[PDB]
Every structure is written in C-alpha cells, then in structure tokens.
C-alpha cells in the first residue's frame, strides 16, 4: 500500500549508497505505478507523489555531471543504455535480484532472524512480482507456473516467520 512505497523509498536510498542506480530507476518506475494502482487517498498522498516526481528528474541529474568529468562518454553509455533500454534493465535486475535472493537465503541461515528480514522478504517478492507482472505477457502460462512456484518457496519462508516458526 502507500506505506509499502515508503519502505521502498528508504530501500531505494540504500541501493544508491551501493551505486545500483540501475535498480533505482526501475524501482522508482514501480513506485509511481504503485501509487496509481493504490486506492485513492487524501491530497497528502498527492503531495508525496509530487516529491517522487522530483526524485525522477533528480535521479537523472543525480550525477550533476561531476562523475562524467572523467570518462564522460562511458558514463553516458552505462546510464543511457541501462535507462533507455528496458530489456537491459530487466537482465540487470535478474543478475542482482537473483543474486540478492540467494545471498539473502544465506543471511537467514548464517544471519539471525529479525523483523527487518521480514520487511526485506516483502520487498524481494515485490521485485520478482513487478518484473514478472510487466513481462507476464512475455512469459508462457507454463513458464509462469514454474516461476510462480519459486515465489511460493520465498513466500513459504515468509509465512513461517509470520507464525514465528522456522523451517
């Protein structure tokens, strides 16, 4: 819901700290789609939507051209190619999104279970549900079945945490 988007904004900043502007651009697009797909809220929500718009323009200008100072041509190729090519954005997400899920499982096993992990599980599923939902038309009904089963496994761990029990 609207609060779900708020958590994404906080997580979006975390990714910027890692230098994953690619995921930031794709996730920001999901944030606006979430607001429009969200139930109508008081004008306060509209004010937050305007601030998000500033982030979009600020996202492209986030560099300010300072990073371009060196190898400016390379910066445009990476920023322009990944931002303009939607397909390039998805494969980049599968590389990080897929690696993030596997590494996340290791954190649950080697790392302690806390409420913060539960919030990350909801966001991880959102990344897969967002990509699959938009590309759902490009996936076969059976191919989707296999991917949907994978989501159940992720949601399964999430449900066990809700009951307080661990696999």
């Amino acid at each position: 819901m609207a609060s779900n988007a708020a958590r994404v904004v906080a997580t979006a900043k975390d990714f910027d700290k890692v230098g994953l502007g690619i995921i930031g651009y794709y996730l920001q697009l999901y944030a606006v789609e979430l607001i429009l797909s969200e139930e109508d809220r008081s004008q306060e929500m509209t004010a937050l939507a305007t601030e998000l718009l500033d982030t979009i323009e600020a996202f492209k200008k986030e560099i300010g051209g300072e990073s371009e100072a060196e190898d400016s041509d390379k910066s445009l190729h990476v920023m322009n190619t990944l931002i303009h090519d939607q397909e390039k954005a998805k494969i980049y997400m599968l590389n990080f999104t897929m690696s993030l899920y596997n590494e996340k499982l290791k954190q649950l096993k080697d790392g302690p279970w806390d409420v913060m992990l539960k919030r990350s599980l909801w966001c991880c599923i959102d990344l897969f549900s967002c990509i699959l939902h938009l590309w759902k038309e490009n996936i076969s009904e059976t191919s989707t079945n296999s991917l949907q089963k994978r989501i159940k496994y992720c949601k399964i761990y999430l449900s066990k945490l809700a009951k307080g029990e661990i696999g």
Partner: peptide, 29 residues
Amino acid sequence: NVPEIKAKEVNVDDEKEDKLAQRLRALRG
C-alpha cells in the same frame, strides 16, 4: 446543512493529475 454530498474528487484535480501522468509517460516514451 445540505443533504447533498459532493464527490470526494473534483474535475479540476482530475486534469492536473492527467498532466502529471503525461509527464511520466513521456519519461518512458
């Protein structure tokens, strides 16, 4: 005072939001 109820949304807000949506669609276009 007036039993009549006004719609929660207003036509003016509808057009302003449409302009904002057009900017986002242009961003992806």
